Amino acid sequence: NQFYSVEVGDSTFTVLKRYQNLKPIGSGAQGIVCAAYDAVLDRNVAIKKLSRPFQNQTHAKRAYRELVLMKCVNHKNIISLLNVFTPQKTLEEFQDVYLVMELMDANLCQVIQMELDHERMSYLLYQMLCGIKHLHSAGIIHRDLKPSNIVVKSDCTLKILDFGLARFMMTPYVVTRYYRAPEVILGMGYKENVDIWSVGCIMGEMVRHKILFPGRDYIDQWNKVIEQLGTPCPEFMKKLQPTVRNYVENRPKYAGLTFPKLFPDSLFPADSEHNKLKASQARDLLSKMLVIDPAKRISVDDALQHPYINVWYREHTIEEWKELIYKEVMN
Ligand SMILES: N#Cc1c(NC(=O)c2cccc3ccccc23)sc2c1CCN(C(=O)CCN1CCCCC1)C2
């Protein structure tokens, strides 16, 4: 037998014998994740368990798409897999999928908590931006970039771990919507620069150490957007479908704040001329990314040109989903 079973968390990991010394890394919406030693490569790996991915269409659509897109994508800032396996011997038996990647060290969340540094922040934004340009080039608009699904290594190398949305489950686990663009909040149709808003959000949070646009749901979240950035002006409303337009036009109006008050110089270092300049460039980039109207928001190409950044330059049953996924594993 080429697998063995072991009781991490309150889960069972049945993994190939090559992977030893399993220890819990963490848990998202998608699966349980363990650190392990890989004896064949003689290095450290992370292994994610997907328990019955085909249990509903959401879990299943996602699982299938992330397996196909991983194989077929290739960039240093986007997950790539070392290995994919199931311990189960037949389609009839099939239950769980295991995905193996090189071990990364931290979440972006833990990085956003660290004091502001211009070399690090710019290099991370550069990488998030090159990753996204890679996704957009391959036909992939993410639409749900959030720091929980972005990982980094001690040497500041960065990878995006998921491919976002395509196009309900009875589970109390709640999705993070804080980084979603206005055109996602308001159901508006979108293009590539939808992902710039989310990078803007992570960047603002790195400076402010507070989620910019929190809320119980999109009602709250929209209030937070308008009262800091102000009510969008007239000609953005005109691309809002009739019902959304009514609601957006009837919230209490806000002037909005200038970026200097939104991100005071007090949040940055001012100990050198270099840091003074980097501070005004950072805020200039934020001001170009946290733009409600996507027609006026900066593109991914313009952002990787910005001087803060450029120093670095579809309907199946669950029986049918089970097979599709099993096939792509074995293949
Ligand atoms: N390395 C790594 C790694 C992840 N990887 C995966 O999610 C993952 C592993 C294998 C294959 C995968 C395939 C597709 C998506 C994700 C995949 S997820 C994750 C990491 C490493 C840093 N992480 C942590 O949250 C660790 C630090 N936490 C601090 C807060 C309390 C708990 C400990 C999150």
Side-chain angles (χ1 to χ4, degrees), residues 99-301:
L99 304 178
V100 189
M101 74 174 283
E102 308 258 20
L103 188 55
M104 307 285 283
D105 294 326
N107 193 290
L108 251 199
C109 309
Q110 316 150 238
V111 176
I112 302 177
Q113 306 212 295
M114 295 175 86
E115 210 187 17
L116 175 137
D117 178 53
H118 288 298
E119 295 165 35
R120 168 186 71 237
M121 171 148 69
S122 59
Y123 181 54
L124 294 181
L125 290 169
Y126 168 70
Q127 287 179 97
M128 271 173 268
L129 289 165
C130 300
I132 291 151
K133 180 203 178 86
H134 204 258
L135 289 187
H136 300 175
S137 300
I140 299 165
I141 302 165
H142 195 285
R143 294 196 271 125
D144 204 12
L145 286 162
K146 63 194 72 170
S148 70
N149 298 326
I150 294 175
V151 285
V152 306
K153 255 225 288 199
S154 287
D155 68 352
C156 283
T157 61
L158 185 138
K159 296 189 175 266
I160 305 148
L161 299 177
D162 79 324
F163 295 99
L165 316 158
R167 185 136 205 161
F168 160 86
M169 324 160 261
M170 283 191 161
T171 175
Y173 201 106
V174 188
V175 173
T176 305
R177 295 192 223 75
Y178 313 138
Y179 307 92
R180 286 176 177 182
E183 54 279 35
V184 177
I185 298 164
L186 300 175
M188 207 181 293
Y190 61 82
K191 279 214 158 75
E192 289 75 358
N193 81 344
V194 66
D195 288 323
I196 286 285
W197 171 276
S198 302
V199 180
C201 293
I202 292 169
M203 180 187 191
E205 193 169 336
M206 283 170 172
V207 173
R208 211 185 247 172
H209 300 299
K210 263 175 254 236
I211 279 139
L212 264 32
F213 307 121
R216 282 171 289 171
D217 67 5
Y218 288 148
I219 298 311
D220 275 8
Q221 191 172 333
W222 179 250
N223 286 332
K224 278 282 180 181
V225 177
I226 60 173
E227 75 190 311
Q228 285 172 122
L229 301 192
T231 307
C233 55
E235 78 104 18
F236 171 77
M237 313 313 201
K238 170 167 266 212
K239 309 184 274 152
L240 291 177
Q241 226 198 320
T243 289
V244 180
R245 196 203 170 197
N246 182 108
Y247 142 80
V248 167
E249 289 196 291
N250 283 290
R251 315 318 265 134
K253 289 245 192 198
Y254 302 97
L257 310 184
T258 82
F259 283 78
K261 296 199 180 176
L262 244 17
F263 302 95
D265 325 354
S266 68
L267 295 175
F268 301 86
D271 65 312
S272 62
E273 291 288 350
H274 176 79
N275 279 319
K276 278 157 159 146
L277 188 55
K278 289 286 137 193
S280 68
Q281 293 174 343
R283 195 192 284 106
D284 189 73
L285 190 43
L286 284 172
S287 91
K288 284 175 176 176
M289 288 181 135
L290 295 170
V291 184
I292 283 173
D293 180 1
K296 301 218 190 204
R297 190 189 307 153
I298 198 168
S299 81
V300 168
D301 294 336

